Amino acid sequence: KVVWVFPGQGTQWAGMGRELLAESPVFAERIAECAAALAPWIDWSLVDVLRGEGDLGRVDVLQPACFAVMVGLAAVWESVGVRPDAVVGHSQGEIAAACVSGALSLEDAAKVVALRSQAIAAELSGRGGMASVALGEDDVVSRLVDGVEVAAVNGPSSVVIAGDAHALDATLEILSGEGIRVRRVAVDYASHTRHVEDIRDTLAETLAGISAQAPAVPFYSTVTSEWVRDAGVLDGGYWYRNLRNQVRFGAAATALLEQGHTVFVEVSAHPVTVQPLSELTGDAIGTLRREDGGL
């Protein structure tokens, strides 16, 4: 059974799909359509930035850009007639999961992602970052210093953590003293932490009146780690929780395993979730690679 896996960050690079946009006609018309749909809230050109002519450090541009190229790739996979048995996202990418699984309208999804990116840009800037840790969740908890929270869990030993930059630096220093493999991510906000508990009102106000219909394709949410079979349950509050609550990506993958789902596709411009799922199962296929946007 085929599961469309939608990641978040780590798949962006200069010139998202310039070659892909030039060669693929269906992707080009689809991305033009989304740019038209995203027009009421942009202050730049989608086609310009996706071709590698804007600012990749601008979060409220890259995140809608990532969403738009994700929709384009999903349309491309639809062209070759790939029927997704299940669709699951990863944090921000979960919005795309809501968009294509029939649980949300494309215009509503574009509106939601635009508002979320704008809010996190106006607020989250300069408040933390991600540290990737190749250690188990229990080991991380043992190593957990104050001010640090596990951003997400993706496997037996794949844990991403987030928090205040000072606490992250202290934890990384102790890790280096212990000499264990840990890396930093060049992002200026600690999402899915206590910081998310600061902009609740604005997010609630923005994501209002969304036509959350029933998912055409079953959606296994990691916020509940559960299948969604209802219309309207996945609300703006749910997206706030997703931005707030941690992602049990490893638990989600394990749940999808015994449910007969084997063929897993990481739709992205660069493989990021290929290995933290392949080490669990080995059945993970990427879509594109960094600087490899060619056909």
DSSP state of 160: E
Distance CA 145, CA 143 (A): 6
Residues 150, 246 contacting (CB under 8 angstroms): yes
Residue 204: how many CB atoms within 10 A of its CB?
14
143 - beta bridge partners? Answer: none
Experimental method: cryo-EM
Contact 21, 28 (CB under 8 A): yes
Measured distance CA(258)–CA(248) in Å, rounded? 16
**At 269, is the secondary structure helix, strand, or coil?**
coil
- Whole-number Å distance between alpha carbons of 25 and 218: 29
Say what the resolution is, in angstroms. 4.0
- Number of H helices and E strands in the chain, helices first, is 12, 11
Q: Which uninterrupted H or E stretch holds 152?
A: strand 148-153
* Rounded alpha-carbon distances, angstroms, from residue 79 to 72, 146, 201: 11, 49, 40
Tokens of 13: 């690079």
Buried b (16+ CB within 10 A) or exposed e, 80-91: eeeebbbbbbbb
What per-residue string of b and e applies to 117-130 under the rule 16 or more CB within 10 Å gives b?
Answer: bbbbeeebeebbbb
- What are the tokens at 241? 């929780």
The first and second tokens of residue 157, run together, are 């030993």
Q: In what order do the strands lie in the sheet with 2-6?
A: 226-228, 219-221, 86-89, 2-6, 263-266, 284-285
DSSP bridge pairs for 3: 86, 264
Q: Can you tell me which residue has the tokens 């939601």?
A: 112
Q: Helical H runs in the chain?
A: 18-23, 25-38, 46-50, 59-79, 93-100, 106-124, 137-143, 165-178, 200-206, 236-244, 249-258, 275-278
**Degrees (nearest 5) of the Cα angle 3, 237, 228?**
30
Query: In which residue are the tokens 């990384």 written?
Result: 172
